[PDB]
C-alpha cells in the first residue's frame, strides 16, 4: 500500500488506488467554498438533525474510542462512508498541516458532477 | 489413553484423589453393555419430526410401536414445523424438566408484503431486535431474551427472506416475524420453520426419523436381532456430560438409593470447580448414574475435613435394590452398638 501497513482493526471498507485521489480533488474543489465540515465536534452535531452529506474517515487513528460511534450514526439515517489510508494527507487536502480524523463533504453549489460521480460509486463497495 | 473411555467416565484421570482402596462387587454393568430389556427402559431418541401431524401424536405412536407405558418430550412443536425433538422412555422421563428449559435455535422464512430497498434494510431491522423483548402470547404480556441473529439470503422478485435465531425456551418465532415487518414499514408473515438445536443434541449428529423407530422394532421381533436397534436408542448417561462428577464407592451405593445423604468417608474422587448450592451428578465406579444432588461443600473444604454431609439428594435414578445392603459395618457405627 505504497508503505501503508499501520491500519486500525476497524477500517473496512477501504478506497481504491485512485478512488481516494478523486475524493481528494472533490474535497479541494469543495474547500473553495464554505461547503465542508471538520472535526468530530462538528460532524456529530450537524448529522444529528437533517444535514445530508458524505463522510470520509482516517484509517490510522489510535485510540479507536475517539470516533467509534460514527458508522452506526450513519447507518441509522442511511448515508455512505469510507476509510482513506492516512490522516497526514487528509489534513493537507483540507488546507491545514495539523492532521485530522474525519471530514464531511456535501452537495456543492454549482457543478455537482464529480460529487455525484463519487457518491453513486461509493454506494457499491463490498459489504464490510 | 483416558480421552476415549465412554460417557461420564472420560478424562477421569484429571480429578483430585481422596482414597484408593475398596473391594469390588458383583452387581450392575456399564450402561453401554446394559441389557435390551432395560437399555430401552432407560433411554431417549433424537427424533426428526415429520410435517403434518401434531406432537402429542408422534409420541403416542412411539408408545404403541415399542411396547412401553410412559414418554415425555423436550419442547413442543406446532404441526407443520420440523426439526429436533427429544423423547424419553420410562425412567428418563424424570429428567424432563431440565430439557424443557434450555437453549434453542431455529431457521425461518418471511414474506414482505410490499417492496423495500435491498438486503440491508432487513439486516438492520434484525439487528435492532436482540436482548429482552416484549411478547404477547397468542394472558399477560411478558419478556424473553434473544442472543443472536443473522441474514442469510433475500430474494427480491418474490420478496422472501431467510434467517437464523438463537434464543430462549418459551419465545415465539411467529410473533417475531410480525414485528420485523411492522417496523420496516411494509408488513410480514411466517412461511416455514425448522428447529435445529435442543439442549446438547444438534441436528448435526445422532438423528433418525420415524421410519427407523418402526423398522428396528420389526427386525428385532422377527429375526431376534438387536444391532439395528441399539443404534436408534441411547442411554441416559449421554445427556448429562456437562454436569459435575462425584464418584462414590461400593457398599454406599445401595444406601443412597435407599435415601441416605452422602457422607465423606465413602467418596473416592471429586471434580475441580464445585460450588455451594449447585447440581452435581453422583456416579458409580462403572459409569452408572445414581442421582442428581445439590452440593454442600466447596471443592476445597472437601480437601480438609474428615466427615459430615456433602450433599442432599434432589432426585434419584437407580433401581431401589440393585446392589446389596452393606451398611452399619465399619470402624465406627459398629462401636456405637457396643453401648
Amino acid at each position: 500500500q505504497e508503505l501503508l501497513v499501520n491500519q486500525n482493526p476497524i477500517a473496512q471498507p477501504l478506497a481504491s488506488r485512485r478512488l481516494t485521489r478523486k475524493l481528494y480533488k472533490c474535497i479541494k474543489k469543495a474547500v473553495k467554498q464554505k461547503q465542508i465540515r471538520r472535526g468530530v465536534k462538528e460532524v456529530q452535531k450537524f448529522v444529528n438533525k437533517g444535514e445530508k452529506g458524505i463522510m470520509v474517515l482516517a484509517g490510522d487513528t489510535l485510540p479507536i474510542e475517539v470516533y467509534c460511534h460514527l458508522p452506526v450514526m450513519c447507518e441509522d439515517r442511511n448515508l455512505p462512508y469510507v476509510y482513506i489510508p492516512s490522516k497526514t494527507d487528509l489534513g493537507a487536502a483540507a488546507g491545514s498541516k495539523r492532521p485530522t480524523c474525519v471530514i464531511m463533504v456535501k452537495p456543492h453549489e454549482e457543478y455537482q458532477e464529480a460529487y455525484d460521480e463519487c457518491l453513486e460509486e461509493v454506494q457499491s463497495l463490498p459489504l464490510p | 489413553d483416558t480421552s476415549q473411555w465412554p460417557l461420564l467416565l472420560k478424562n477421569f484421570d484429571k480429578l483430585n484423589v481422596r482414597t484408593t482402596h475398596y473391594t469390588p462387587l458383583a452387581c450392575g454393568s456399564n450402561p453401554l453393555k446394559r441389557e435390551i430389556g432395560d437399555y430401552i427402559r432407560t433411554g431417549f431418541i433424537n427424533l426428526d419430526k415429520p410435517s403434518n401431524p401434531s406432537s402429542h401424536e408422534v409420541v403416542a405412536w412411539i408408545r404403541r410401536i415399542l411396547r412401553v407405558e410412559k414418554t415425555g418430550h423436550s419442547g413442543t412443536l406446532d404441526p407443520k414445523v420440523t426439526g429436533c425433538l427429544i423423547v424419553c422412555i420410562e425412567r428418563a422421563t424424570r429428567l424432563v424438566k431440565s430439557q424443557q428449559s434450555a437453549g434453542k435455535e431455529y431457521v425461518g422464512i418471511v414474506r414482505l408484503h410490499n417492496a423495500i430497498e435491498g438486503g440491508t434494510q432487513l439486516s438492520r431491522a434484525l439487528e435492532t431486535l436482540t436482548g429482552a423483548l416484549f411478547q404477547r402470547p397468542p394472558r399477560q404480556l411478558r419478556v424473553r431474551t434473544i442472543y443472536e441473529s443473522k441474514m442469510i439470503e433475500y430474494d427480491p422478485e418474490r420478496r422472501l427472506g431467510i434467517f437464523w435465531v438463537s434464543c430462549e425456551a418459551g419465545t415465539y418465532i411467529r410473533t417475531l416475524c410480525v414485528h420485523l415487518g411492522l417496523l420496516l414499514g411494509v408488513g410480514g408473515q411466517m412461511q416455514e420453520l425448522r428447529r435445529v438445536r435442543s439442549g446438547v443434541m444438534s441436528e448435526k449428529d445422532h438423528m433418525v426419523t420415524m421410519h427407523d423407530v418402526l423398522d428396528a422394532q420389526w427386525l428385532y421381533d422377527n429375526h431376534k436381532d438387536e444391532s439395528y436397534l441399539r443404534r436408534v436408542v441411547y442411554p441416559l448417561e449421554k445427556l448429562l456430560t456437562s454436569h459435575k462428577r462425584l464418584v462414590m464407592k461400593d457398599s454406599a451405593v445401595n444406601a443412597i438409593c435407599y435415601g441416605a445423604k452422602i457422607m465423606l468417608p465413602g467418596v473416592l474422587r471429586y471434580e475441580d470447580g464445585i460450588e455451594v448450592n449447585q447440581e452435581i451428578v453422583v456416579i458409580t465406579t462403572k459409569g452408572e448414574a445414581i442421582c442428581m444432588a445439590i452440593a454442600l461443600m466447596t471443592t476445597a473444604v472437601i480437601s480438609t475435613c474428615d466427615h459430615g454431609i456433602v450433599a442432599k439428594i434432589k432426585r434419584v435414578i437407580m433401581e431401589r435394590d440393585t446392589y446389596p445392603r452393606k451398611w452399619g459395618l465399619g470402624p465406627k457405627a459398629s462401636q456405637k452398638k457396643l453401648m
Binding site: - | H113, T128, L129, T130, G131, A132, L133, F134, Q135, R136, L141, V143, V178, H179, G181, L182, L183, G185, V186, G187
Partner: protein, 94 residues
Amino acid sequence: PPERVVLLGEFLHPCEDDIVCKCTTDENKVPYFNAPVYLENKEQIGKVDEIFGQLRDFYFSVKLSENMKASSFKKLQKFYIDPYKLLPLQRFLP
C-alpha cells in the same frame, strides 16, 4: 375524557393503514392494552394494539378511529395518554 394527559411519544413511518410510534414517556412506564390515545388538546384518535422492541426504548403502534388517515399526521408529532393507565417497569423485572 381523562383529567390530564402525559407525553407518550413521537410519530414515524406508517404501515398498512396504521401508524408506528416511538415511546418516550418519563421513567419507562409501559401502557395498558387497548387504552385510548389522545391528541395534544384532548382529542381522541385511536387505541394501542401492539408493543415490541427492546426493554428500555420500545416502540408501539396505533389502531385509528374512523375519520383518520396515515397522511394527516406529520413527522415526530406528539400523542398523549391518560396517566392512570400506565404500569411501572418494576413488576416486569425479577
